[PDB]
Amino acid sequence: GPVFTKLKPWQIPKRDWFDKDFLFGASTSAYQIEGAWNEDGKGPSTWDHFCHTYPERISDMTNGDVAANSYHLYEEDVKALKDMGMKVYRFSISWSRILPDGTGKVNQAGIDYYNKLINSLIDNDIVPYVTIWHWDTPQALEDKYGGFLNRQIVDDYKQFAEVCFKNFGDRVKNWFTFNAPHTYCCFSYGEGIHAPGRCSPGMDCAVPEGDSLREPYTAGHHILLAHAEAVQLFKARYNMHGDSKIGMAFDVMGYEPYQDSFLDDQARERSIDYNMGWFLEPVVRGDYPFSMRSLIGDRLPMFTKEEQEKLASSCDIMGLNYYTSRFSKHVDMSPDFTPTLNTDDAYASSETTGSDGNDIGPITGTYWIYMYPKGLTDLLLIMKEKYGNPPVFITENGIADVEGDESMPDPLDDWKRLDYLQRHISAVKDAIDQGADVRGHFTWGLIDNFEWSLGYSSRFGLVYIDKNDGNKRKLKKSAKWFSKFNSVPKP
Amino acid sequence: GPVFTKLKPWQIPKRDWFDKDFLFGASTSAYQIEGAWNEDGKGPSTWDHFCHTYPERISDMTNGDVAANSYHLYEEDVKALKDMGMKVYRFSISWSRILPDGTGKVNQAGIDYYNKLINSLIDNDIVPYVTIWHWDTPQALEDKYGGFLNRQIVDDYKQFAEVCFKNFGDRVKNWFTFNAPHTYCCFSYGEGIHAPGRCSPGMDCAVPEGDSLREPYTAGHHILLAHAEAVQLFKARYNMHGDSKIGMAFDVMGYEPYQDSFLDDQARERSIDYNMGWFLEPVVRGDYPFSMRSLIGDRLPMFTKEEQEKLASSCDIMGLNYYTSRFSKHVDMSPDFTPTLNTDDAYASSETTGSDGNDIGPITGTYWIYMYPKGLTDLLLIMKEKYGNPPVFITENGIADVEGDESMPDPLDDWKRLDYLQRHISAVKDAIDQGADVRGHFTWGLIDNFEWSLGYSSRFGLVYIDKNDGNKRKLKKSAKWFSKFNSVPKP
Amino acid sequence: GPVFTKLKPWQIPKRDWFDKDFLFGASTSAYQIEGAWNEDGKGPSTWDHFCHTYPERISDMTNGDVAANSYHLYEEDVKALKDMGMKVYRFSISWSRILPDGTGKVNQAGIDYYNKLINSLIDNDIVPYVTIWHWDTPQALEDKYGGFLNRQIVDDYKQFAEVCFKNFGDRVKNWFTFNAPHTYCCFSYGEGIHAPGRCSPGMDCAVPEGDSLREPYTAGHHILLAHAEAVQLFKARYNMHGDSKIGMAFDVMGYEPYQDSFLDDQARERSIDYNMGWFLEPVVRGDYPFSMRSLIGDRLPMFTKEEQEKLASSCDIMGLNYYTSRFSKHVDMSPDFTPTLNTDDAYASSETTGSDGNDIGPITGTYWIYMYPKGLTDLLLIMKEKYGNPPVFITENGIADVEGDESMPDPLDDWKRLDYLQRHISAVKDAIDQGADVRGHFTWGLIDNFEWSLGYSSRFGLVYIDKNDGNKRKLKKSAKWFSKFNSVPKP
Numbered sequence A, B, C: 001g002p003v004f005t006k007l008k009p010w011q012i013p014k015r016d017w018f019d020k021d022f023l024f025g026a027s028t029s030a031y032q033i034e035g036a037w038n039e040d041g042k043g044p045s046t047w048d049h050f051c052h053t054y055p056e057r058i059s060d061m062t063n064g065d066v067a068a069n070s071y072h073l074y075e076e077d078v079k080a081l082k083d084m085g086m087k088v089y090r091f092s093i094s095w096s097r098i099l100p101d102g103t104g105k106v107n108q109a110g111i112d113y114y115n116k117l118i119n120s121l122i123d124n125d126i127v128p129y130v131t132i133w134h135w136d137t138p139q140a141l142e143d144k145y146g147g148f149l150n151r152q153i154v155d156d157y158k159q160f161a162e163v164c165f166k167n168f169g170d171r172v173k174n175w176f177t178f179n180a181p182h183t184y185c186c187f188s189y190g191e192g193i194h195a196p197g198r199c200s201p202g203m204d205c206a207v208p209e210g211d212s213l214r215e216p217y218t219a220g221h222h223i224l225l226a227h228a229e230a231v232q233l234f235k236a237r238y239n240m241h242g243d244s245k246i247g248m249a250f251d252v253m254g255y256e257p258y259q260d261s262f263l264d265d266q267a268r269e270r271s272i273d274y275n276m277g278w279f280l281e282p283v284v285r286g287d288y289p290f291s292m293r294s295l296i297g298d299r300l301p302m303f304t305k306e307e308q309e310k311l312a313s314s315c316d317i318m319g320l321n322y323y324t325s326r327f328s329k330h331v332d333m334s335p336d337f338t339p340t341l342n343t344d345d346a347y348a349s350s351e352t353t354g355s356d357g358n359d360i361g362p363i364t365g366t367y368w369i370y371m372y373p374k375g376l377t378d379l380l381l382i383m384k385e386k387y388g389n390p391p392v393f394i395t396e397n398g399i400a401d402v403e404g405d406e407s408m409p410d411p412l413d414d415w416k417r418l419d420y421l422q423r424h425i426s427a428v429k430d431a432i433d434q435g436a437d438v439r440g441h442f443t444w445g446l447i448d449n450f451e452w453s454l455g456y457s458s459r460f461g462l463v464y465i466d467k468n469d470g471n472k473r474k475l476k477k478s479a480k481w482f483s484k485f486n487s488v489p490k491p
């Protein structure tokens, strides 16, 4: 109550279930953990600005001014990884910390910071995987031309990426250009609950003077073009040794038909196309899914022949951020239905409950994460069978422990997160057993952090951040399981 | 709310899904519809007695004194069958109406009644299937020696069966010796909620001076012996033409493991053994399931070599009464668990909710019937693969519309029962497609009737009985669907 | 005659059929090869005592006083392994040689011996796998409190294990707490043909004053508790580096239903539960198989909550000792059958001949080993599908060349053993191909040894021991095949 059944002990994954090359790690993002939002010359990002001018748009009215203060305490992050025996760490680089004005002079203090983190990770036998952008846009560019709604963001992003390549490319060999593009577009320009908080007039978001049916697509189109330019540059001048890889990380939910009928089967396909295909298909074949173009038309920008070719095969590795799944319920095209939110264009509503009234799976804490590991295996098999089976990393996976939930009184006793993670690691094993080329699993939540519009009320970390005890890092039950799982020598 | 999703129109069964020989019908039982409990010489049954001396043990404090008064209105029952186009009608013969004293002089008025019903069914091109006993024991024998708890019931039942064979055998060619033996033993001698209402001292039933760990098995053992004797007699003297068939109808629930583990897989097997195997395995191989003997031991009577042989292969046709399914949760043998109810001997608790917290299926009205058609298909495939694939008839299948349920305001608008029935008829099609030898489907509920301890508060009929309008028969939406399904000529 | 068909040359396993990490080795046990039964302070074991006071209980009236004299000639054992190119050697440690009185002062001469063997194996690039106990109990403890029939054996064994851990744990990283627990209990306390030779009064064994229906279970229960204590200690203080593994080696026979019927299918499951589940299920879930508890009841000791948890998941690696298979024939529960031997509790007789009269497979020499490689593959797939697919090593596998068998005139020309081994190695390949996590194959019989109650009359070695030529080691045809198989450089 809420009845949460755990795996039988013999069904718990062991490290040897995966080969020696498989990689276990954890992930974080700059704004969610760094803090020092205006220290040593760092310029403001769209999230600094969003929180500072519309504080009420954050659940518990908190922000990322300090977060986990990883800007100063990064050594503790490295130690937590080491203690758990993680082989890889995926973190993001703050665009505004590197280039305070989005463009122009680079902030050497910013470059020094990341070089320290990188060298520390390497000193501790941990491989650094870098996310170039994680919703982290310089407010300078946002003020100048509307950030990602303007084509100028394409070359500006390219230059930013190049700064990262030349300064860290000698040690960092794996990159992700963008993180969760679909969620970013939906929340930042559709519902407007995320920075810059734009939506259509009449809707309830910070700044209701956008267009929920167009801005999300405009932003997504620029993201893809920026990605294409950065990768072309990378392949041309920053992979001389031939051992570097660059890709993108997509946020994806699994889908099951709401009701067993060919209609909901088709709806499920439209849902996958919209959630995953939106940004994956372009980097694979150089164009959006046919379903999206047929339903969105003029509101979805066309690619030029040159862009199409630039985008096709522009990923060496694919990142999949997976948390949950939904039932896909078919919506008919008729005068009775008129899209108002970009997500309406899929003509498939995402339902948490199936045709028999049952939830897709056990709730895990935060309202949107229902546990359904099968969904991940299915998505991985689609990557294999439909998209050429490219190298895939689960770049995000986990659950939140919510404040106020009395079934989670001890923040360190996260047996629920542990069971969830073990089940998804097992689901990845199933996919690998079926031929999917899955290369690693990065738990979302190296440490508790600023969970965007939900503030700190949601704890996603393997490692607790004691905000009342100087932001101390304290390993949770889940983290300790990893220590054992990874055979970390005992003190 | 309660969200009840209906089949898509193209998923609705058509009569031609089944071959020309397949049989669609409906069922009833003497005490549940006849009435005239003491008319024309009929003696009292254990249910007349149970209701008359412990009226409070019936939900709405009603009884079967008149029920649907089919004793007088049987012509209306025949007409309802005809109007729906049913090919078969399965009804039961009242032991106490035929032999008021259980033994001795036969009540000619009783014999005349059934001969009228039989001839009327034949006159209307409907084949009569007869259930010899349906919990319908003469209170005379109950008073004399404890009814089914005494071995004398074996020969008395045999003589009763013979009276039926010689008087109706020239026209009736298909028989079921007993109906729902497992439910009868569990409720009449375990929980004691059914006549004669016996249970262990300290338990809450009409007469708590029995033994819930022994009487159920004693009664079941006598039922099997009685069955064996009746069939031997039938095969020897009442099947001279070789075209008659006799079997038994078993009440069965489907089972799914509570949690995915070999332990609950084993628990599911024990549940099937206990619910279905208890009486099916003896008529198949001549002995109870091994699991039951290993867990019940001395409390489960042994069969003699002669009885074992008499029982083996004693069924020409199998009847399956299916309504719902449950999850089977494993219970360990230990000092912490001590059986008190016969059902505890299976060491597998029947759960309505799975390991993920979800109900097995949509509720349909009465509290114990959750919709799960897959369960029926699975049981039918077990009959095929494990028990020799004998001829099987779904002798009971349906749901109840409960009084007080405001989501069912019009008693004739039973679209929920219709959807449920269509789904189970489809499930039978699936089994047939997979090789199961299923010969027919009899809906439980030709008409609303006396639903034992729940009185008339539960309406299971395809045909409404207007108790306020002289017990008039009125076809419900479900019944009208059958008229179309069966291509009945229109007036 | 006996017609023994060999594999076609293209069906013979090649080393590259298995990956680089797969391990090929051979096994032995202290009492079967060491000799020097009372040298340098070693105290007597239950087998020294058994042979010395009941010499007639040994087939050819021989014993292990000297055996292969490996106490002095261990260098020759190491050389044989090297010559065959074996990567691993699994040997056992003599409890009585380490602690002459079972408890107390450690015999330094014993510790020095094993340190020499270990260092020699390492010097020759061979990894040592150690079996802590192989039926090898100190007669001191047997005299003091009845050995394994007394709970005191639990802590005494624990202390013995600790002595092994602290003295050899720096170089030995893989352990097996006990070997063939099922066979030990059945033969030592059921039939009593093995030391201490106990059985029920009226039976024919050395000391018929035990209880074949209880002592086997009492001994097995103490074995499991001892195992649990030793592993907990190991994990807590002797795996600081996280690279050590400890498990158990189970003797297991494959089973096929005697006749094709659900009854023999159920019997097969009971046979597997009894032979393999008896000790495997406790180390997996912390309790005996349900079938055993349901049939053995009070004669099978209960585990406490603490013990159950201590036992669950107490194995890092599983050892499977496989030689043959049998048909499982169902036995009904009835007054006509009363158990007298512990093995009777499975209600499934192990038959060498099937329902069609045919033997399960070709005889190989000794009367109990019929060749049936399919049985091993099936057991390995059960480990995978039912028990979580833990790391498995075939810790024993082979056949005997019997003295007096004129179809085996040249003891070095063991082409039959070679064919048998190649077929089982191929069977392991099949299991691996189907997903079973099999890590290695250890042939039973590094060299001919003392085969318990059959003395030296049975030769199980890959390497001949010329007892008439100073116990010289001479490679047989099988051994030479391994040299080629393993690509050992030629002289």
Ligand SMILES: COc1ccc2c(c1)O[C@H](O[C@@H]1O[C@H](CO)[C@@H](O)[C@H](O)[C@H]1O)C(=O)N2O
Residues within 6 Å of the ligand: A029, A032, A179, A180, A183, A251, A252, A253, A321, A323, A368, A396, A444, A451, A452, A460
């Ligand atoms: C607010 O509800 C919600 C619904 C769907 C999704 C999100 C949020 O965000 C997810 O994206 C990740 O969320 C985690 C946990 O909040 C963040 O820490 C990560 O930075 C973010 O990528 C999800 O992708 N999206 O579907």
Ligand SMILES: COc1ccc2c(c1)O[C@H](O[C@@H]1O[C@H](CO)[C@@H](O)[C@H](O)[C@H]1O)C(=O)N2O
Residues within 6 Å of the ligand: B029, B032, B179, B180, B183, B251, B252, B253, B321, B323, B368, B396, B444, B451, B452, B460
């Ligand atoms: C009272 O709850 C309950 C639970 C399980 C079962 C029954 C009742 O009775 C069922 O047997 C059939 O029930 C129908 C509907 O009440 C009657 O009209 C039939 O006469 C009876 O055979 C079911 O078999 N049993 O599992």
Ligand SMILES: COc1ccc2c(c1)O[C@H](O[C@@H]1O[C@H](CO)[C@@H](O)[C@H](O)[C@H]1O)C(=O)N2O
Residues within 6 Å of the ligand: C029, C032, C179, C180, C183, C251, C252, C253, C321, C323, C368, C396, C444, C451, C452, C460
């Ligand atoms: C005596 O017949 C017999 C029947 C079954 C079994 C055994 C003997 O012993 C086996 O155990 C292994 O046997 C080999 C060969 O004799 C010994 O050298 C090993 O030490 C022993 O583990 C088998 O497990 N058992 O089923």
